[PDB]
Amino acid sequence: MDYKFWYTQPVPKINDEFNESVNEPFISDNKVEDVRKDEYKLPPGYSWYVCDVKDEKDRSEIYTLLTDNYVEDDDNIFRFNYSAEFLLWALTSPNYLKTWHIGVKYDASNKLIGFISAIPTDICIHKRTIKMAEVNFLCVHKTLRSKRLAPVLIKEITRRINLENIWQAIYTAGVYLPKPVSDARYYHRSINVKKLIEIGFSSLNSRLTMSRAIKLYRVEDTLNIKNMRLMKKKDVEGVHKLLGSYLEQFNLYAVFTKEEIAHWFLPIENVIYTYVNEENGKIKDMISFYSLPSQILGNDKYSTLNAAYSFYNVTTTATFKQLMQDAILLAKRNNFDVFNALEVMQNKSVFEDLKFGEGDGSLKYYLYNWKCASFAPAHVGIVLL
């Protein structure tokens, strides 16, 4: 299309394509002293609001906004429905800034109608480790769309990030925008076939009768890696070394400190599940997935799709296929209806064998103020929320 906001930003033009040797900002030698100290102007009747995500009621306001107004399927039957506890987890990572949790209220009602957030993350792109902001949960009320409010929320968080002497960010979206560094399709592994069939997530065809679809997806309730267990605090140094060593092979990944591993992976019910295999006091395999329900739009029988999303999975004692089979099984044991995954890291390699179906669209990865060659999603080693 035209990208009249994006073309004023430091991001590639749609036709830009860079050599592998290119790996730099679009704009360097930036100065915290020069950054605007004034808040970006909102339309008359709207005000900035600083959300405190540790405050139950502020967190609840953001929860309601996203519940009613966040990402939907381009057929409009499902809306992402992140839990309040998930938001807490997602937004209170180590060294997070309260002031990168930005809301917009309509003054006359005092209601939150807009939101955008960022957490700090060390990101390695093509073997350069950069302090970045990981931006997410950009949301404008459905009553207020196409009013050019998103660029205000965007310019306003950029300014707040820049005040911290950070000049780059990472972000993902399903819409195509100038310009992805990688593009990863999503795949779904049915667990509760019948429910999926009933709510129109999956389909039957004459050869695949209901009972055949159910038999197709059925799994044995026995782990390939028998000692896979919920991670605990004692496990963090071992996960740090396992995952950390594994991630170094990729073109794009997060460099986690121990404190970050503890946050990202220590299990929280209905938010984040990590399983580990400990052999001789070493952590040799891990599995992790997060909970992201979709509200079912207008179904007289089901209100919620329980979905597990593949997070970080490493094996040194089994095949990757065996590990991901256990991951599916662990997700089944925790009452999930489906197991989603992106064609990132080694995932694509197992989708056919493990009966994944191809989804409808893809997820684009983006960098802000960074210039580099684009790459296929198997070289992507980071999963955003």
Ligand X SMILES: CCCCCCCCCCCCCC(=O)CSCCNC(=O)CCNC(=O)[C@H](O)C(C)(C)COP(=O)(O)OP(=O)(O)OC[C@H]1O[C@@H](n2cnc3c(N)ncnc32)[C@H](O)[C@@H]1OP(=O)(O)O
Q: With binding defined as CB under 6 A, does residue 136 bind ligand X?
A: yes
How many angstroms separate the CA atoms of 243 and 247, rounded? Answer: 6
**Of these partners, ligand X, Mg ion, ligand X25, none, which one is at the site of residue 26 (CB under 5 to 8 Å by kind)?**
none
DSSP 182-226: EEEEEEEEESSHHHHHHTTSS--BTTB-HHHHHHHH---S--SST
| Count of CB atoms situated within 10 Å of the CB of 125 | 21
The residues, any chain, with a CB within 8 Å of residue 233's CB and separated by 6 or more, are 262, 266
Residue 65 Cβ, how far from ligand X at the closest point, in Å?
Answer: 9
Rounded CA gap, 279 and 276, in Å?
Answer: 10
**Cα dihedral 144, 148, 154, 157 sign:** negative
At 114 the three-state DSSP class reads strand
Q: Which of 3, 58, 72, 278 binds ligand X25 (CB under 6 A)?
A: 72
**DSSP at 173:** E
* Residue 111 binds Mg ion, judged by CB under 5 A: no
Residue 228 within binding range of ligand X25, rule CB under 6 A: no
Nearer to ligand X, 3 or 320 (CB): 3
Q: How many alpha carbons fall within 13 Å on the CB side of residue 315?
A: 17
* Residue 2 CB burial class (10 angstroms; 0-12, 13-18, ≥19): exposed
Q: Is residue 147 a contact residue for ligand X (CB under 6 A)? A: yes
**HSE value, Cβ hemisphere, 13 Å, CA-based, for 106:** 10
Please choose which of ligand X25, ligand X, Mg ion, none residue 359 contacts, taking the beta carbon within 5 to 8 angstroms, the exact cut-off set by kind. ligand X25
CB of 155 to ligand X25, least distance (A): 22
| Contact pick of 13, 36, 147, 234 for Mg ion (by CB under 5 A) | 147
Say if CB 384 and CB 136 are below 8 A apart. yes
Query: What is the contact mask toward ligand X in residues 59 to 78, using x (rule: CB under 6 A)?
Result: ----------xxx-------
Query: Is there binding between residue 81 and ligand X (CB under 6 A)?
Result: no
Residue 288 is which amino acid?
A: S
Q: Are 114 and 153 in contact (CB under 8 A)?
A: yes
Among 88, 176, 359, 373, binds ligand X25 (CB under 6 A): 359
Q: Is 196 annotated as a binding residue?
A: no
Task: Report the residue from 149, 191, 242, 383 that binds Mg ion according to the rule CB under 5 A.
Answer: 149
Give the per-residue contact string, 76-115, with ligand X25 (x = CB under 6 A; - = no).
--xxx-----------------------------------
CA 143 and chain centroid, separation:
25
**Binding to ligand X by residue 3, rule CB under 6 A?**
yes
Give kind and range of the element (H or E) at residue 156.
helix 149-162
- Name the 3-class secondary structure at 139: strand
- On whether the CB atoms of residues 112 and 103 are closer than 8 A, the answer is yes
Binding mask 164-203 for ligand X (x = CB under 6 A): --xxxx-xxx-x-x--------------------------
Pull the structure tokens for residue 2: 């035209």
- Give the count of residues interacting with ligand X25 (CB under 6 A): 19
Rg of the chain (C-alpha set): 21
Q: Is 149 in the site for ligand X (CB under 6 A)?
A: yes
The residue within the footprint of ligand X25, chosen from 100, 106, 167, 186 (CB under 6 A), is 186
At 145, is the secondary structure helix, strand, or coil? coil
Angle between helices 258-265 and 236-247 (to 10 degrees): 100
Least distance CB 33 / ligand X25 (angstroms): 35
Residue 29, marked binder: no
Choices 147-155, 158-166, 240-248, 351-359; region in contact with Mg ion by CB under 5 A: 147-155
Q: Which residue numbers belong to the known binding site for tetradecanoyl-CoA? A: 3, 5-6, 70, 137-138, 140, 146, 148-150
- Site for ligand X, rule CB under 6 A: 3-6, 69-71, 133, 135-140, 145-151, 154, 157-158, 161, 166-169, 171-173, 175, 177, 368-369
- Site for Mg ion, rule CB under 5 A: 140, 147, 149
Q: Which residue numbers belong to the known binding site? A: 3, 5-6, 70, 137-138, 140, 144, 146, 148-150, 300
Q: Which residue numbers belong to the known binding site for Mg(2+)? A: 144, 300
- Site for ligand X25, rule CB under 6 A: 71-73, 78-80, 172, 186, 292, 294, 309, 340-342, 359-360, 363, 384-385
